[PDB]
Design a protein around this ligand. Sequence first.
Ligand SMILES: CCNc1ccc(C)nn1
Length: 435
Amino acid sequence: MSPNGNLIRMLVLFFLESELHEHAAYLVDSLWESSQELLKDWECMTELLLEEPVEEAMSDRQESALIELMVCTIRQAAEAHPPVGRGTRVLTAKERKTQIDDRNKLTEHFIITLPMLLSKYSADAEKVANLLQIPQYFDLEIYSTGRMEKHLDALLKQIKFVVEKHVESDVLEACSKTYSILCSEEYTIQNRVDIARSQLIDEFVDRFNHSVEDLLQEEADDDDIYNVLSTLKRLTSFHNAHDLTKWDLFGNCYRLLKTGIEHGAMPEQIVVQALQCSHYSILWQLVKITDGSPSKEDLLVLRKTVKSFLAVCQQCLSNVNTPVKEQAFMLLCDLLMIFSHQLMTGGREGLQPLVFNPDTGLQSELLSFVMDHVFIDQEANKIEALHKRRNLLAAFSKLIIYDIVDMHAAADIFKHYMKYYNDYGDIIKETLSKT
Ligand SMILES: CCNc1ccc(C)nn1
């Protein structure tokens, strides 16, 4: 009760104070043979997190660590295997028996307790996003079984708060994922979640729409700009895993982008999101068209939409802010690959009118960006920034393989930049091989 609360308080301390375990997931996994009993005392943990002290309280760091540790114990119990990175699969009867029993325990528990955790920590983005990893492990059918409808409502109340309080992409994307989870994994609860969601959305589309109108008609306020971005972010995060086509978001994003080119002064993060949102509208419009049995005009209305958006992305290469360019670029290398001739794979030759081949002028800018923004001259930010430029290239590389840009102009740029490996490589190799 408090004997395990002593052991768990000091386990959080051994994690933080010693750099002997860098990743919580690996620490948990290592103790899991010898200390399963302790690590699945979820009541003990939620207690520590929710109670008020007698003496000695928990510090904001140790609170965070406990939550991260907790989530890893929840995962290891649900999945019944070591975390990704320590893997190697077949269970014994008693192991399989334990898996079910644990899954039941944490579900019943966290259904009750996760809304309370979210409530208490509703403004701590790292913490909130870490807690919202939990419902993916739920035995979701228990929302009927325990007559537990009361706490499904409660989680949904708290998710609605979180999305209303926050703009960080980790938190929002955590909320969206959690909705998808709660939706199409049980009919019993589906209709209930569907409503809280499409209300959540409605309240944000109306807010965004008024903000979009506010911004464009106005000289524009720091608020008019806050309002557009803040709402758009929420909707874009969600638009990835949720089909928001019924609200014509593409139209207003398209205006926002058009204003940013025309008059040249749209704030960078509005432009980036406006793009990403538009792209997700386009993917989802496509998906309904593949799976449906679409007409001549259906295709042609999507075509006009796609060509207007490829145009915007191209023009957005010329935006001063390099984040915009990379987004613009990313979407070009996605879309030119998506609406390539591979769109007539799998007996889908109805889709010919949706195919696009990029023009010379465009291809020359898709080459330009690589010389300008993959291949560049000069802590933690740079190992990260590199993997992105890697991705930008790998995304461009796909276009080159299937001859969607000029493969020869590309490899000429690869020549120009690999020069010193081809002029002095052997020499640098054998030198380094004797030291
Ligand atoms: C037209 C409404 N927008 C405004 C005005 C003034 C301030 C400070 N903020 N926002």
